[PDB]
């Protein structure tokens, strides 16, 4: 008989005992557990994707990307538990370092010092530099995907929605795309972008920085179509030059149809913020994604000078250079084989 949690099978033993329900995540039930080999408590995520192709896609991305990546600011996969055979495999359990909290939970009740904001931002960008160097876009950066342990080591998690960057095929039509989580979604997603360029991730980091400064999301759209209203309400009307970069007529004419809006100065929105932090914020939350600061520039920004050290900001050895659910299950089975005894 497998272990049960909340009346649901959570079959991780015998290596992992003393289970404690933590909650529900994007993939399902999450528990903590005692790792009897490493004598430490761990996090375990139960995934049940095999009945749906799209679930299999996300699960395969998550596993394949995290197994290849090795970086201090990216969550590792310590172990993967599943049945010994493909026909017996229904659930997959991903084992990771237990982390005290995440930035979403933290920002609910804790004010961050400028020193913490600086340190968190540095770690996010250090992790992102590695991700982008692997030719990968995370595409769902937000506070709840930033894990923190008791000593404020930050690790980026959930690569289920990630893609290989494809800037030459990024252009699309107006109001069609569905990339990232709404509050953290770049303006071009609603205008003319499929979210296949690294600048998508930098926008999200900008949103996260703003949220660290005030403990409130900076662009709280109430639904998909509301999000652009909030972004433009703060950035103001885009310039002629930036509009000229949008060739799509529906997108450009939508923007031209709007009354003028003034830029709201960052120092009025954040009167207690470090001036260097606001300068960097402005560069990450730049409307035109071609003008938007890139991850290596952001690391070199004066705000982060106490931490900046390119030789200690490693890149990926093996970038990613480039199906029915049954084939995906087979790939998930193969991808997880290394953890079997």
Annotated binding site for ATP: 22-30, 45
Q: Which of 98, 131, 156, 280 lies at the binding interface for ligand DX4 (CB under 6 A)? A: 98
Q: How far apart are CA 339 and CA 171, in angstroms?
A: 40
Q: Which is nearer to ligand DX4, 150 or 311 (CB)?
A: 150
140 is catalytic: yes
Q: Write out the binding residues for ligand DX4, residues 57-96 only, by CB under 6 A.
A: 75, 96
Contacting residue, 19, 83, 86, 99, with ligand DX4 by CB under 6 A: 99
Complex with ligand DX4: residue 43 or 207, whichever CB lies closer: 43
Stated length of the chain: 341
Binding mask 232-271 for ligand DX4 (x = CB under 6 A): ----------------------------------------
The two structure tokens encoding residue 305? 């000078």
We find the least distance from the C-beta atom of residue 11 to ligand DX4, in angstroms, to be 19
Contact 67, 78 (CB under 8 A): no
Distance CA 20, CA 80 (A): 18
152-171 footprint of ligand DX4 as x/- string (CB under 6 A): -----x--------------
Q: Mention every residue, 6+ apart, whose C-beta is less than 8 A from residue 337.
A: none
CA angle 167, 168, 172 (to 5 degrees): 85
Residue, CB closest to ligand DX4: 43
Quickly list DSSP for 176-237. ----S-GGG--HHHHHTB-S-STHHHHHHHHHHHHHHHHSS-SS--SSGGGHHHHHHHHH-S
Query: Cβ of 250: how many Cβ atoms within 10 Å?
Result: 13
Closer Cβ to ligand DX4, 147 or 165, answer by number: 147
Q: How far is the CB of 110 from ligand DX4 (least distance, A)?
A: 16
CB 112 within 8 A of CB 123: no
Provide the minimum distance between the beta carbon of 200 and ligand DX4 in the complex, in angstroms, as a whole number. 23
* C-beta of 148 vs 298, nearer to ligand DX4: 148
Q: With CB under 6 A, what is the number of residues at the site for ligand DX4?
A: 11
Q: Which of the residues 79, 91, 102, 140 is marked catalytic?
A: 140
Helix, strand, coil percent content, the chain, rounded in steps of 5: 40, 15, 45
Which residues between 129 and 148 bind ligand DX4 (CB under 6 A)?
147
Cβ at position 99, least distance to ligand DX4 in Å: 4
Residue 60 or 98: the one with the smaller Cβ distance to ligand DX4 is 98
Tokens read off for 147 = 């894990």
- DSSP state at residue 74: B
Q: Of the two residues 74 and 231, which places its CB atom closer to ligand DX4 in the complex?
A: 74
**176-205: contacts with ligand DX4 (CB under 6 A):** none
Are 237 and 229 within 8 A, CB to CB?
no
- Shortest distance in whole angstroms from residue 220 CB to ligand DX4: 23
Residues 16-55 interacting with ligand DX4 (rule: CB under 6 A): 22, 25, 30, 43
Buried b / exposed e along 135-158 (16+ C-beta atoms within 10 A): bbbbbbbbbbbbbbeeeeebbbbb
Query: Is 228 among the residues that bind ligand DX4 (CB under 6 A)?
Result: no
Measured distance CA(104)–CA(106) in Å, rounded: 5
300 part of the interface to ligand DX4, by CB under 6 A: no
Catalytic residues, by residue number, are: 140
Which residues make up the interface to ligand DX4 (CB under 6 A)? 22, 25, 30, 43, 75, 96-99, 147, 157
């Amino acid at each position: 008989g497998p272990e049960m949690v909340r009346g649901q099978v959570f079959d991780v033993g015998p290596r992992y005992t003393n289970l404690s329900y933590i909650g529900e995540g994007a993939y399902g039930m999450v528990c903590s557990a005692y790792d009897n080999l490493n004598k430490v408590r761990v996090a375990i995520k139960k995934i049940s994707p095999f009945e749906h192709q799209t679930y299999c896609q996300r699960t395969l991305r998550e596993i394949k990307i995290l197994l290849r990546f090795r970086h201090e600011n990216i969550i590792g996969i310590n172990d993967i538990i599943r049945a010994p055979t493909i026909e017996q495999m229904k659930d997959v359990y991903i084992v990771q370092d237990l982390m005290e909290t995440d930035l979403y939970k933290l920002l609910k009740t804790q004010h961050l010092s400028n020193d913490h904001i600086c340190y968190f931002l540095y770690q996010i960008l250090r992790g992102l530099k590695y991700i982008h160097s692997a030719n990968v876009l995370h595409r769902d950066l937000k506070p709840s995907n930033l894990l923190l342990n008791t000593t404020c080591d930050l690790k980026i998690c959930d690569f289920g929605l990630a893609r290989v960057a494809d800037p030459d095929h990024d252009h699309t039509g107006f109001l069609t795309e569905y990339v990232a989580t709404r509050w953290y979604r770049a303006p071009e997603i609603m205008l003319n972008s499929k979210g296949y360029t690294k600048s998508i991730d930098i926008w999200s980091v900008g949103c996260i920085l703003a949220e660290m400064l005030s403990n409130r999301p900076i662009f709280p759209g109430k639904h998909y179509l509301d999000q652009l209203n909030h972004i433009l309400g703060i950035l103001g009307s885009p310039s002629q030059e930036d509009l000229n970069c949008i060739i799509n007529l529906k997108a450009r004419n939508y923007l031209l149809s709007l009354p003028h809006k003034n830029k709201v100065p960052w120092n009025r929105l954040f009167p207690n913020a470090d001036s260097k932090a606001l300068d960097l914020l402005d560069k990450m939350l730049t409307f035109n994604p071609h003008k938007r600061i890139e991850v290596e520039q952001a690391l070199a920004h004066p705000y982060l000078e106490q931490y900046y050290d390119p030789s200690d900001e490693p890149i990926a050895e093996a970038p990613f250079k480039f199906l029915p659910k049954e084939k995906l299950k087979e790939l998930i089975f193969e991808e997880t084989a290394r953890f079997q005894p």
